[PDB]
Amino acid sequence: SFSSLYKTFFKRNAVFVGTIFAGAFVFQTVFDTAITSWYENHNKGKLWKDVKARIAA
Amino acid sequence: MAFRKSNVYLSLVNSYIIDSPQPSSINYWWNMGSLLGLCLVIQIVTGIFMAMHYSSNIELAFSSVEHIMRDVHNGYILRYLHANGASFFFMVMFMHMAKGLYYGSYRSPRVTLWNVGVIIFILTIATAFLGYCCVYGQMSHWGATVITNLFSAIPFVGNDIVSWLWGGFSVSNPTIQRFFALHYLVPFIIAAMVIMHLMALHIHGSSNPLGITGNLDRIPMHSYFIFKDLVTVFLFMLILALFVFYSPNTLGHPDNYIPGNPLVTPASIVPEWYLLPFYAILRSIPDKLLGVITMFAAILVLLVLPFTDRSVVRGNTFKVLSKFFFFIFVFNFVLLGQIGACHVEVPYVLMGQIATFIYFAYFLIIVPVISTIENVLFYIGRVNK
Amino acid sequence: KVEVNLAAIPLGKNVVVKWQGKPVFIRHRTPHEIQEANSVDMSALKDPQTDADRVKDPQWLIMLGICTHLGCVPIGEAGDFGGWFCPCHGSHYDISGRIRKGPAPLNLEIPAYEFDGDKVIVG
Amino acid sequence: MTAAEHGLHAPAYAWSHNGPFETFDHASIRRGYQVYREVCAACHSLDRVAWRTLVGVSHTNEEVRNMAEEFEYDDEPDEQGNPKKRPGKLSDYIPGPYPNEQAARAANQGALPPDLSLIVKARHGGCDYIFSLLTGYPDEPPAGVALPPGSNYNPYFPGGSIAMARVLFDDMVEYEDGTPATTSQMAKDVTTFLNWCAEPEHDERKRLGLKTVIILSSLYLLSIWVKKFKWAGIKTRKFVFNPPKPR
Amino acid sequence: GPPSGKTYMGWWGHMGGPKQKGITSYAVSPYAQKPLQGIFHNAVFNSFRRFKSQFLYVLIPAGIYWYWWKNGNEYNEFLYSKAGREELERVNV
Amino acid sequence: GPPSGKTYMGWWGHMGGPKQKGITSYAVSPYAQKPLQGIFHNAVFNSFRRFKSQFLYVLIPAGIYWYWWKNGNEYNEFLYSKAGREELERVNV
Amino acid sequence: PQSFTSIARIGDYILKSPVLSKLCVPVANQFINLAGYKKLGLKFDDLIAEENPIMQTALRRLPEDESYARAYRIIRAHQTELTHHLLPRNEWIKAQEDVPYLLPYILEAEAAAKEKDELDNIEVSK
Ligand SMILES: CCCCCCCCCCCCCCCC(=O)OC[C@H](COP(=O)([O-])OCC[N+](C)(C)C)OC(=O)CCCCCCCCCCCCCCC
Ligand code: HEC
Ligand code: HEM
Ligand code: HEM
Ligand code: FES
C-alpha cells in the first residue's frame, strides 16, 4: 500500500512538513530520555544519587 | 520571468546560490569556501553571545571568561565552540589556500580573487590574535607583549607606534580594552571582504580540478552543490562537535588558565597553533626588524605567485614535479609550525632557517623553474622532430 | 614616573617594586659592596661597563628586574657572585648587576631616574 | 631544555573519568573535598568555587549550609557606617587562607601558592600531573642535586625544586565512609575534586556530546545518501559523439 | 544598468564556449536509479586505484620531513642529556 | 549575468523615456560664465516670491498647534496654581 | 604566462640536438605517461588555459571539426573526473593521436601579437 502511504504522507507538502515536525518533537523527548537513561546506567555508582543512597545507608 | 530573478535581493541570492553555474567536475575541495562561511557565522554568533557576558577590563577579563565557563548557562558550549571553531576556521582556511595553490586558482582571471583572499587571510590572522589576547591568560599577555614589542624595531617611530598600540607603557588595561573593541569590529570587515571575495569569484566563475575551461559542462548550484556542500557541513559539524564536547582543550595551550601575570615569564611564550609557522619565520631571522619584515613577507609572498607560476596549463593535476614540490611545500609548512612550537635550541634554529628558506624558495625559485621545465617536457614529449 | 622614598630602606636590603609593568629594585649598598663593584677588571666582563656609568648614586643601586636572556626574574640576593640569580637558565649577576656567567648577552638595564633629597623619581 | 628542567612527564593513570562515556566519581569528589578542607585549605585557595555548586555533587543543601555558616565574610555596613561581618551563605565563595599575596608569601617562604580552581586545566598532564606531583616526593633527593634551603625535591615539578613540602602522609584524614586514606588514595581524591573544580560541566558536557555525536553522525550518513540520490542523474550521464557533416 | 567588462563566463544560454554539435547527452531520473550503486566495489577497488596513483607524491615528502624532524628531535634529546654536554657546549659556544 | 525585472530607468543611452525630436539644448561653459550672478537679486526678490507663495501652508498649521499648545500650557499653569485648585480637584476627580 | 614561442624555441633546440634528444625525450615521454591526461581522453592542447586573448584568438581560428572534437573531449573528461573513474583502456588517447593541433594557431597568433607590440614601440632611426 505504498500508494496509500505516499498519498497520506508525502503527497501534500504541508502534511509532510507537519509529520516531520511531529516526529522531531517526539524524537527530541524520546532521544533525550533514552540518552540520559543510558548515560546514568552506564555510570552506575558514580552519580550523586548513588553517593546519596550510600550516605543514607 | 521568475520572482527569484525579477526581485532586487532574490536575484542576488539566485545568481550567487541558486542558479550559480558551477562546473560539473569540481570535487570536495571546493566545499571549503562554504565551510569557511559556516565557520565565520559560527564565530560571529558565539562571539556576540559571549560578548553579552564578557568584561574587557584587565581585572575582569579572565574572571569574566571563567564566569562564562561556570555561571552562564551553556556558556562552556559557547566558549569551546568559539575557540575550537577558530582552530577549525584556520584549518579550513589552510585547506582553501592550499587547494588554490594546487589547482592554479590564482592565475590570470582570478588574480583579484586571490588578492582579496590574501587580504582576508591577513584580517583573520589579526582577528585571531586580538581574540586570543582578549582572554588575558598567561599566553595571551605574553603573546601580546612579544608580538607588539616587535614593532619597536622600526628605527624611526618604533617606540611611538608601540606606545600607541599599548595605550601606555606595557600591555595593560587600555591594551586589552583596545583589543576587545578591535576584536568586535574586524570580523565585520571580514564579512565585507567575503562579499568582495564573492564578487571577484562571481565575475569569472569557479575553477575545476582539470584546469581546462568549464564553460561547456555546467550545473546550477542549487540541488547539486547545496547537498554536496551539506555533506561537508555536517562532517565539519561532526568533527567540531567531537573537539568541543570530548577533547575541548586539546588545541589550546594549558598556560592560558593561569591569570595574566606581568611579572612571571611562563618559560615558553607560544601563540595559537595556526600562527606558529609565521612565528617560526619570525624567529628564524636573527634581527628584530628583518624578522617582522620576513613574517609580513611570509604572508605577502602569495601575491607574487600569479606572476611566478610560469606554466601554460593551470593547476598541478597533470604535473608530476609540481605535485611533488607542492606536497614538499605542505609538509615544510607543517615542519615550520612544529619548529615554532619548539624552544630556541641547537638543531631547531638551523632547521627553522632552512625551512624558512624552502618556504620562500617555493614561490620565488622552485615554481618558475619547475613550471618552465614542465612546459619544455610537455612540448617535446609529443612534438616529433 | 613614580617616586620611592629612600628613608625606610635600611643599609643592606633590597626593595622590589613594579613600575610600568616591569620589576625595579633599589639596594642600599655597603661600602664593601661598592669596593667589590669597582674592584672587577673589565676583561672579566662580556658586556663591560663601570659603576659610575651604571649608577648615579653609589649608595643607591637602582635597576630593572628583567634578566637579559629571555625576561625571567633573578632571585633576590641569590647566586654565587653575591648578586642576583636568574633560575630559568642559570644566569648570574654581581651587585653591580653585570653579566659574568650565563646565557645573558647584556647587563641588567638601568632605568632613568632622578633624586629629590631622600627620595627617587624613576621615569 | 634538559629533562630536569622539563620535569618528568606524569604517566597516564586510569582515572575514573577518562574515556568519552565516563563521569566523575562523586564519592571521590566528597572525599577530595574532605582532604582539601583538612589539609590543602591551610595554604591553597579556591576563589572560583561558590558554595552553591557543591550542592548535588558532593554534599547536600543543608550539608553545604553548615560549612558556609562556619566561614565569615563581609556584610553591608550597619546604620552607623561601621564594618560588619556576616556568617556566609550559599551565594558566597570558598574563602582562601590569606588576605593577600603579600601575607601568603610571608607565610610560605616567599613563594605564592596558586589558587587551585583551574590548576587541573592549567598544567600539562592535568590530573596525572597533580597526582604524580603529590605522590612522588622522594624521601631523599638524588645524589648531587644542589638544593636551596626550604625547597623540597620533586621530579615531576619543572626544575626539580618545588617550594611545597610533602603534605600527604598516611591516615592524616579520617574519611567519613571508612575508606582507608593512604597517601595515594587522598591524592587521587583531591585530584578528582580539583578536576571537578576545573571542569564542573564535565558530566553534562559528555552527555550532550553523546547526543550531539549520534545526531550529527546520523545527519552525515543521511546527507551522503541524499547527495548521491540527487547526483545520480548527473553521475550516470552518457555522452556520445557522432561527428557532424563538414559544412 | 551599465555593462561590465569582458568575462570568460556568461549565464544560462550564452556561456561563451565553443559551438557544440554532435555531442548527445543521456541521463536517467534518479528516482528510477539506485543510489549507493557500486559503493562496495569502488570503496575497495577504485579507492585502491586512486591510492596507488597518488601516494608517492604525498608520502615521499612526508617521509623526508618526518625523518628530518625525528632526527633533529633525537639530536636535541642527545644534546640536552648528560652524555652529550661536551658537544652541547661546543655547538652552543 | 542574469537579467533583472522591467525597471523604469535604463542607463546613459537607453533611459526609457520617449523619443525626442526638436528639443534643442544650449549650454555655455561655466568658465565663460559668472557664478554668483544674480544672487543679490534672487536673494531679496525670488526668495520673497517663494516665501509668499509657500507660507500659508506652513504658517496656519504652525499657528494652530502653537496656539493649542500655548492654551494648554496656560490652562495647566492655572490649574496647578492656588487660584484654580477647586477646578483642579473637579477635573481630576 | 610563458610565451608559446619560447617553449617552441627551447624545445626545437632540444630536439635538433642529437645528444639532448636522446637524453631528454624519454624523460618527457615518461613524464607525459605519468601526467595521466591521456587516461581522461584529453590531448595536451585541451589542457592549455584558454582565458587569455592569444588562446581565444587561436580557438576562434580553429577549424570546426577540431572544435567539435575538442568540445567532446573536454565534456568527456569532465564527466569522467566527475564519476571519479578513468576512461577504459581502449578509450585512452594513443600516443600517435596526441598531436599538437592548436599549436600552429597559437604560434601564429603569438607572432602576430609580438610583431604588433614591436611596431607599437618602434623608434624610427632619425
Ligand atoms: C600559506 C599556505 C599554506 C598552504 C598549506 C597548508 C597546509 C596544507 C593544507 C591541507 C592540504 C591540502 C591539499 C589540497 C591539494 C589537493 O586537493 O590534493 C588533491 C590530490 C590529487 O588530486 P588531483 O590532482 O585533483 O587529481 C585528481 C584527478 N586524477 C588526475 C587523479 C584523475 O590528492 C592527493 O594527492 C591527496 C592529498 C590529500 C591531502 C591531505 C592532507 C595532507 C597534508 C596534511 C598536513 C597536515 C597534517 C599534519 C598536521 C600535524
Ligand atoms: C601548605 C603550606 C600547603 C599544603 C597543605 C598544600 N600545598 Fe600545594 N603548594 C604550596 C606552596 C607554597 C606552593 C608553591 C610552590 C611553587 O611555587 O612551586 C604549592 C604548589 C602547588 C601546585 C602547583 C605546582 C606547580 O606549579 O607545578 C599544586 C597543583 C598544588 N600545590 C596542589 C596541592 C594539593 C592538591 C594539595 C592537597 C592537600 C596541596 N597542594 C597542599 C603549599 C601547600
Ligand atoms: C573572525 C572570526 C573570529 C575569530 C577567528 C575569533 C577568534 C577568537 C579566538 C581564537 C579567541 C580566543 C578563544 C579562546 O582561546 O578562549 C577569541 C575570543 C573571543 N572572541 Fe572571538 N573570534 C571571532 C569572532 C568574534 C566576534 C565577531 C566576537 C564579538 C562579537 C568575538 C568575541 C570574542 C570574545 C568575547 C572572546 C573572549 C574569550 C572567550 O570567551 O572565548 N569573536 N576569538
Ligand atoms: C573567510 C574566508 C573565506 C571565505 C568565506 C571564502 C569563500 C569562498 C568561496 C565560497 C569560494 C567559492 C567556492 C570555492 O571555490 O571553494 C571561494 C573561492 C576562492 N577563494 Fe575563498 N574564501 C575565503 C578565504 C580565502 C583565502 C584565505 C584565499 C586565499 C588567498 C581564498 C582564495 C580563494 C580562491 C582562489 C578561490 C577560487 C577557487 C576556485 O574557484 O578554484 N579565499 N572562496
Ligand atoms: S631568562 Fe634570565 S636566565 Fe634565561
PDB file of N, CA and C and ligand atoms in Angstrom, chain B residues 39-40 42-52 54-55 61 64-65 68 75 78-80 82-87 89-90 123-125 127-136 140 180 183-188 190 252 256-257 272 274, ligand 3:
ATOM      1  N   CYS B  39      32.130  28.653   9.242  1.00  0.00           N
ATOM      2  CA  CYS B  39      32.999  28.980  10.373  1.00  0.00           C
ATOM      3  C   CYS B  39      32.830  30.428  10.794  1.00  0.00           C
ATOM      4  N   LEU B  40      32.697  31.334   9.825  1.00  0.00           N
ATOM      5  CA  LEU B  40      32.535  32.747  10.147  1.00  0.00           C
ATOM      6  C   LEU B  40      31.202  33.016  10.830  1.00  0.00           C
ATOM      7  N   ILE B  42      29.588  30.828  12.664  1.00  0.00           N
ATOM      8  CA  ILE B  42      29.743  30.237  13.996  1.00  0.00           C
ATOM      9  C   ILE B  42      30.508  31.181  14.915  1.00  0.00           C
ATOM     10  N   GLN B  43      31.612  31.737  14.409  1.00  0.00           N
ATOM     11  CA  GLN B  43      32.450  32.631  15.198  1.00  0.00           C
ATOM     12  C   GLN B  43      31.709  33.898  15.576  1.00  0.00           C
ATOM     13  N   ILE B  44      30.980  34.489  14.630  1.00  0.00           N
ATOM     14  CA  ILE B  44      30.298  35.747  14.906  1.00  0.00           C
ATOM     15  C   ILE B  44      29.148  35.537  15.886  1.00  0.00           C
ATOM     16  N   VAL B  45      28.420  34.426  15.763  1.00  0.00           N
ATOM     17  CA  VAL B  45      27.273  34.217  16.642  1.00  0.00           C
ATOM     18  C   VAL B  45      27.721  33.878  18.062  1.00  0.00           C
ATOM     19  N   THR B  46      28.670  32.944  18.208  1.00  0.00           N
ATOM     20  CA  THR B  46      29.167  32.630  19.544  1.00  0.00           C
ATOM     21  C   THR B  46      29.937  33.797  20.146  1.00  0.00           C
ATOM     22  N   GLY B  47      30.505  34.661  19.303  1.00  0.00           N
ATOM     23  CA  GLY B  47      31.189  35.825  19.817  1.00  0.00           C
ATOM     24  C   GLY B  47      30.247  36.866  20.374  1.00  0.00           C
ATOM     25  N   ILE B  48      29.119  37.092  19.704  1.00  0.00           N
ATOM     26  CA  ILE B  48      28.124  38.019  20.236  1.00  0.00           C
ATOM     27  C   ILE B  48      27.528  37.478  21.529  1.00  0.00           C
ATOM     28  N   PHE B  49      27.207  36.185  21.548  1.00  0.00           N
ATOM     29  CA  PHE B  49      26.605  35.619  22.743  1.00  0.00           C
ATOM     30  C   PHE B  49      27.579  35.459  23.900  1.00  0.00           C
ATOM     31  N   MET B  50      28.886  35.556  23.668  1.00  0.00           N
ATOM     32  CA  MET B  50      29.786  35.701  24.804  1.00  0.00           C
ATOM     33  C   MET B  50      30.128  37.145  25.122  1.00  0.00           C
ATOM     34  N   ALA B  51      30.042  38.053  24.148  1.00  0.00           N
ATOM     35  CA  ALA B  51      30.265  39.464  24.427  1.00  0.00           C
ATOM     36  C   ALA B  51      29.155  40.046  25.276  1.00  0.00           C
ATOM     37  N   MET B  52      27.992  39.399  25.289  1.00  0.00           N
ATOM     38  CA  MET B  52      26.955  39.758  26.247  1.00  0.00           C
ATOM     39  C   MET B  52      27.341  39.470  27.696  1.00  0.00           C
ATOM     40  N   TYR B  54      31.075  39.018  28.622  1.00  0.00           N
ATOM     41  CA  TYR B  54      32.497  39.260  28.813  1.00  0.00           C
ATOM     42  C   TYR B  54      32.732  40.701  29.239  1.00  0.00           C
ATOM     43  N   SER B  55      33.733  40.907  30.089  1.00  0.00           N
ATOM     44  CA  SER B  55      34.131  42.229  30.551  1.00  0.00           C
ATOM     45  C   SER B  55      35.605  42.436  30.247  1.00  0.00           C
ATOM     46  N   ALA B  61      38.880  40.362  32.802  1.00  0.00           N
ATOM     47  CA  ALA B  61      38.891  39.606  31.557  1.00  0.00           C
ATOM     48  C   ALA B  61      38.869  38.110  31.829  1.00  0.00           C
ATOM     49  N   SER B  64      35.854  37.075  33.825  1.00  0.00           N
ATOM     50  CA  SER B  64      34.612  37.040  33.067  1.00  0.00           C
ATOM     51  C   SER B  64      34.575  35.859  32.111  1.00  0.00           C
ATOM     52  N   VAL B  65      35.725  35.443  31.579  1.00  0.00           N
ATOM     53  CA  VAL B  65      35.738  34.234  30.756  1.00  0.00           C
ATOM     54  C   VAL B  65      35.439  33.014  31.617  1.00  0.00           C
ATOM     55  N   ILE B  68      31.803  32.960  32.164  1.00  0.00           N
ATOM     56  CA  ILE B  68      31.139  32.295  31.047  1.00  0.00           C
ATOM     57  C   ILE B  68      31.257  30.785  31.189  1.00  0.00           C
ATOM     58  N   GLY B  75      27.449  28.197  28.707  1.00  0.00           N
ATOM     59  CA  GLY B  75      28.496  29.127  28.341  1.00  0.00           C
ATOM     60  C   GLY B  75      29.783  28.424  27.999  1.00  0.00           C
ATOM     61  N   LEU B  78      29.499  27.743  24.377  1.00  0.00           N
ATOM     62  CA  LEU B  78      29.819  28.897  23.541  1.00  0.00           C
ATOM     63  C   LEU B  78      31.314  29.166  23.507  1.00  0.00           C
ATOM     64  N   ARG B  79      31.989  29.011  24.645  1.00  0.00           N
ATOM     65  CA  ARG B  79      33.416  29.311  24.696  1.00  0.00           C
ATOM     66  C   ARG B  79      34.234  28.263  23.953  1.00  0.00           C
ATOM     67  N   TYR B  80      33.947  26.978  24.180  1.00  0.00           N
ATOM     68  CA  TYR B  80      34.658  25.939  23.449  1.00  0.00           C
ATOM     69  C   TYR B  80      34.295  25.952  21.974  1.00  0.00           C
ATOM     70  N   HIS B  82      33.565  28.735  20.227  1.00  0.00           N
ATOM     71  CA  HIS B  82      34.314  29.866  19.686  1.00  0.00           C
ATOM     72  C   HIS B  82      35.791  29.529  19.503  1.00  0.00           C
ATOM     73  N   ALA B  83      36.409  28.913  20.513  1.00  0.00           N
ATOM     74  CA  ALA B  83      37.841  28.634  20.447  1.00  0.00           C
ATOM     75  C   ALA B  83      38.166  27.540  19.431  1.00  0.00           C
ATOM     76  N   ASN B  84      37.513  26.383  19.548  1.00  0.00           N
ATOM     77  CA  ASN B  84      37.798  25.317  18.606  1.00  0.00           C
ATOM     78  C   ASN B  84      37.244  25.613  17.221  1.00  0.00           C
ATOM     79  N   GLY B  85      36.227  26.468  17.098  1.00  0.00           N
ATOM     80  CA  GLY B  85      35.806  26.903  15.789  1.00  0.00           C
ATOM     81  C   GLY B  85      36.767  27.878  15.162  1.00  0.00           C
ATOM     82  N   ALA B  86      37.531  28.612  15.970  1.00  0.00           N
ATOM     83  CA  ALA B  86      38.604  29.412  15.397  1.00  0.00           C
ATOM     84  C   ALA B  86      39.741  28.530  14.898  1.00  0.00           C
ATOM     85  N   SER B  87      40.059  27.465  15.642  1.00  0.00           N
ATOM     86  CA  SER B  87      41.040  26.497  15.144  1.00  0.00           C
ATOM     87  C   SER B  87      40.556  25.814  13.865  1.00  0.00           C
ATOM     88  N   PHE B  89      38.313  27.142  11.747  1.00  0.00           N
ATOM     89  CA  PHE B  89      38.378  28.231  10.777  1.00  0.00           C
ATOM     90  C   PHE B  89      39.740  28.279  10.115  1.00  0.00           C
ATOM     91  N   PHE B  90      40.797  28.153  10.901  1.00  0.00           N
ATOM     92  CA  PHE B  90      42.110  28.217  10.284  1.00  0.00           C
ATOM     93  C   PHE B  90      42.510  26.916   9.596  1.00  0.00           C
ATOM     94  N   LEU B 123      43.450  39.693   7.653  1.00  0.00           N
ATOM     95  CA  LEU B 123      42.471  40.165   8.629  1.00  0.00           C
ATOM     96  C   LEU B 123      42.041  39.067   9.593  1.00  0.00           C
ATOM     97  N   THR B 124      41.991  37.819   9.133  1.00  0.00           N
ATOM     98  CA  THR B 124      41.598  36.726  10.011  1.00  0.00           C
ATOM     99  C   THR B 124      42.707  36.370  10.990  1.00  0.00           C
ATOM    100  N   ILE B 125      43.968  36.443  10.542  1.00  0.00           N
ATOM    101  CA  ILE B 125      45.105  36.296  11.448  1.00  0.00           C
ATOM    102  C   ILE B 125      45.071  37.367  12.531  1.00  0.00           C
ATOM    103  N   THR B 127      42.413  39.062  13.616  1.00  0.00           N
ATOM    104  CA  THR B 127      41.271  38.803  14.493  1.00  0.00           C
ATOM    105  C   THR B 127      41.572  37.709  15.506  1.00  0.00           C
ATOM    106  N   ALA B 128      42.209  36.624  15.053  1.00  0.00           N
ATOM    107  CA  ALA B 128      42.564  35.533  15.953  1.00  0.00           C
ATOM    108  C   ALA B 128      43.565  35.985  17.004  1.00  0.00           C
ATOM    109  N   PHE B 129      44.515  36.842  16.619  1.00  0.00           N
ATOM    110  CA  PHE B 129      45.485  37.352  17.586  1.00  0.00           C
ATOM    111  C   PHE B 129      44.819  38.219  18.651  1.00  0.00           C
ATOM    112  N   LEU B 130      43.949  39.149  18.235  1.00  0.00           N
ATOM    113  CA  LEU B 130      43.301  40.029  19.210  1.00  0.00           C
ATOM    114  C   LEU B 130      42.355  39.253  20.116  1.00  0.00           C
ATOM    115  N   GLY B 131      41.665  38.254  19.568  1.00  0.00           N
ATOM    116  CA  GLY B 131      40.769  37.465  20.388  1.00  0.00           C
ATOM    117  C   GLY B 131      41.484  36.536  21.339  1.00  0.00           C
ATOM    118  N   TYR B 132      42.662  36.050  20.955  1.00  0.00           N
ATOM    119  CA  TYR B 132      43.470  35.288  21.895  1.00  0.00           C
ATOM    120  C   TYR B 132      43.967  36.177  23.016  1.00  0.00           C
ATOM    121  N   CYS B 133      44.324  37.423  22.695  1.00  0.00           N
ATOM    122  CA  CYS B 133      44.748  38.350  23.734  1.00  0.00           C
ATOM    123  C   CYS B 133      43.591  38.856  24.586  1.00  0.00           C
ATOM    124  N   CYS B 134      42.343  38.646  24.159  1.00  0.00           N
ATOM    125  CA  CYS B 134      41.198  39.070  24.963  1.00  0.00           C
ATOM    126  C   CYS B 134      40.963  38.197  26.188  1.00  0.00           C
ATOM    127  N   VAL B 135      41.402  36.937  26.165  1.00  0.00           N
ATOM    128  CA  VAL B 135      41.204  36.043  27.304  1.00  0.00           C
ATOM    129  C   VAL B 135      42.022  36.510  28.493  1.00  0.00           C
ATOM    130  N   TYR B 136      43.185  37.091  28.218  1.00  0.00           N
ATOM    131  CA  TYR B 136      44.181  37.538  29.189  1.00  0.00           C
ATOM    132  C   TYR B 136      44.592  36.414  30.136  1.00  0.00           C
ATOM    133  N   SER B 140      48.273  34.816  26.604  1.00  0.00           N
ATOM    134  CA  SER B 140      47.669  35.986  25.983  1.00  0.00           C
ATOM    135  C   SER B 140      48.475  37.239  26.269  1.00  0.00           C
ATOM    136  N   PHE B 180      39.689  44.326  22.625  1.00  0.00           N
ATOM    137  CA  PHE B 180      38.316  43.839  22.582  1.00  0.00           C
ATOM    138  C   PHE B 180      37.458  44.641  21.617  1.00  0.00           C
ATOM    139  N   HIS B 183      38.550  43.411  18.263  1.00  0.00           N
ATOM    140  CA  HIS B 183      38.117  42.047  18.005  1.00  0.00           C
ATOM    141  C   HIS B 183      36.623  41.980  17.747  1.00  0.00           C
ATOM    142  N   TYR B 184      35.856  42.915  18.298  1.00  0.00           N
ATOM    143  CA  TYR B 184      34.473  43.008  17.859  1.00  0.00           C
ATOM    144  C   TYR B 184      34.386  43.565  16.442  1.00  0.00           C
ATOM    145  N   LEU B 185      35.165  44.605  16.121  1.00  0.00           N
ATOM    146  CA  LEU B 185      34.989  45.296  14.843  1.00  0.00           C
ATOM    147  C   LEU B 185      35.428  44.458  13.645  1.00  0.00           C
ATOM    148  N   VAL B 186      36.668  43.974  13.646  1.00  0.00           N
ATOM    149  CA  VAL B 186      37.345  43.441  12.455  1.00  0.00           C
ATOM    150  C   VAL B 186      36.629  42.265  11.771  1.00  0.00           C
ATOM    151  N   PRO B 187      35.913  41.356  12.457  1.00  0.00           N
ATOM    152  CA  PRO B 187      35.090  40.376  11.714  1.00  0.00           C
ATOM    153  C   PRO B 187      33.994  40.947  10.826  1.00  0.00           C
ATOM    154  N   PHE B 188      33.527  42.165  11.058  1.00  0.00           N
ATOM    155  CA  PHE B 188      32.591  42.719  10.092  1.00  0.00           C
ATOM    156  C   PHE B 188      33.321  43.257   8.872  1.00  0.00           C
ATOM    157  N   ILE B 190      35.802  41.501   7.867  1.00  0.00           N
ATOM    158  CA  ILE B 190      35.971  40.204   7.216  1.00  0.00           C
ATOM    159  C   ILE B 190      34.715  39.813   6.447  1.00  0.00           C
ATOM    160  N   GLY B 252      44.205  23.941  22.719  1.00  0.00           N
ATOM    161  CA  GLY B 252      44.601  25.095  23.490  1.00  0.00           C
ATOM    162  C   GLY B 252      45.856  24.845  24.301  1.00  0.00           C
ATOM    163  N   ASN B 256      47.030  29.132  29.382  1.00  0.00           N
ATOM    164  CA  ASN B 256      46.055  30.216  29.354  1.00  0.00           C
ATOM    165  C   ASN B 256      45.100  30.182  30.528  1.00  0.00           C
ATOM    166  N   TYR B 257      45.089  29.112  31.310  1.00  0.00           N
ATOM    167  CA  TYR B 257      44.262  29.069  32.501  1.00  0.00           C
ATOM    168  C   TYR B 257      44.983  29.600  33.725  1.00  0.00           C
ATOM    169  N   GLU B 272      48.824  30.819  19.441  1.00  0.00           N
ATOM    170  CA  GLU B 272      47.993  29.712  18.997  1.00  0.00           C
ATOM    171  C   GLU B 272      48.624  29.019  17.797  1.00  0.00           C
ATOM    172  N   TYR B 274      47.885  27.983  14.844  1.00  0.00           N
ATOM    173  CA  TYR B 274      47.778  28.363  13.445  1.00  0.00           C
ATOM    174  C   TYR B 274      48.651  29.552  13.086  1.00  0.00           C
TER     175      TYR B 274
HETATM  176  C1  HEM H   3      36.579  36.274  12.554  1.00  0.00           C
HETATM  177  C2  HEM H   3      36.082  35.401  13.418  1.00  0.00           C
HETATM  178  C3  HEM H   3      36.609  35.267  14.784  1.00  0.00           C
HETATM  179  C4  HEM H   3      37.739  34.623  15.159  1.00  0.00           C
HETATM  180  C5  HEM H   3      38.702  33.929  14.233  1.00  0.00           C
HETATM  181  C6  HEM H   3      37.835  34.743  16.566  1.00  0.00           C
HETATM  182  C7  HEM H   3      38.910  34.190  17.263  1.00  0.00           C
HETATM  183  C8  HEM H   3      38.955  34.170  18.634  1.00  0.00           C
HETATM  184  C9  HEM H   3      39.818  33.391  19.421  1.00  0.00           C
HETATM  185  C10 HEM H   3      40.855  32.435  18.944  1.00  0.00           C
HETATM  186  C11 HEM H   3      39.541  33.642  20.704  1.00  0.00           C
HETATM  187  C12 HEM H   3      40.210  33.025  21.886  1.00  0.00           C
HETATM  188  C13 HEM H   3      39.378  31.810  22.293  1.00  0.00           C
HETATM  189  C14 HEM H   3      39.985  31.122  23.474  1.00  0.00           C
HETATM  190  O1  HEM H   3      41.102  30.580  23.366  1.00  0.00           O
HETATM  191  O2  HEM H   3      39.369  31.091  24.559  1.00  0.00           O
HETATM  192  C15 HEM H   3      38.517  34.590  20.738  1.00  0.00           C
HETATM  193  C16 HEM H   3      37.995  35.088  21.886  1.00  0.00           C
HETATM  194  C17 HEM H   3      36.875  35.886  21.915  1.00  0.00           C
HETATM  195  N1  HEM H   3      36.152  36.314  20.862  1.00  0.00           N
HETATM  196 FE1  HEM H   3      36.497  35.854  19.084  1.00  0.00          FE
HETATM  197  N2  HEM H   3      36.796  35.444  17.042  1.00  0.00           N
HETATM  198  C18 HEM H   3      35.994  35.777  16.026  1.00  0.00           C
HETATM  199  C19 HEM H   3      34.806  36.500  16.039  1.00  0.00           C
HETATM  200  C20 HEM H   3      34.344  37.119  17.187  1.00  0.00           C
HETATM  201  C21 HEM H   3      33.398  38.147  17.213  1.00  0.00           C
HETATM  202  C22 HEM H   3      32.721  38.728  15.995  1.00  0.00           C
HETATM  203  C23 HEM H   3      33.214  38.490  18.544  1.00  0.00           C
HETATM  204  C24 HEM H   3      32.353  39.530  19.147  1.00  0.00           C
HETATM  205  C25 HEM H   3      31.062  39.712  18.897  1.00  0.00           C
HETATM  206  C26 HEM H   3      34.076  37.668  19.297  1.00  0.00           C
HETATM  207  C27 HEM H   3      34.157  37.720  20.658  1.00  0.00           C
HETATM  208  C28 HEM H   3      35.156  37.052  21.351  1.00  0.00           C
HETATM  209  C29 HEM H   3      35.268  37.151  22.802  1.00  0.00           C
HETATM  210  C30 HEM H   3      34.351  37.899  23.716  1.00  0.00           C
HETATM  211  C31 HEM H   3      36.318  36.418  23.176  1.00  0.00           C
HETATM  212  C32 HEM H   3      36.743  36.316  24.626  1.00  0.00           C
HETATM  213  C33 HEM H   3      37.191  34.984  25.238  1.00  0.00           C
HETATM  214  C34 HEM H   3      36.189  33.902  25.015  1.00  0.00           C
HETATM  215  O3  HEM H   3      35.093  33.982  25.593  1.00  0.00           O
HETATM  216  O4  HEM H   3      36.461  32.939  24.272  1.00  0.00           O
HETATM  217  N3  HEM H   3      34.763  36.844  18.456  1.00  0.00           N
HETATM  218  N4  HEM H   3      38.165  34.897  19.466  1.00  0.00           N
END
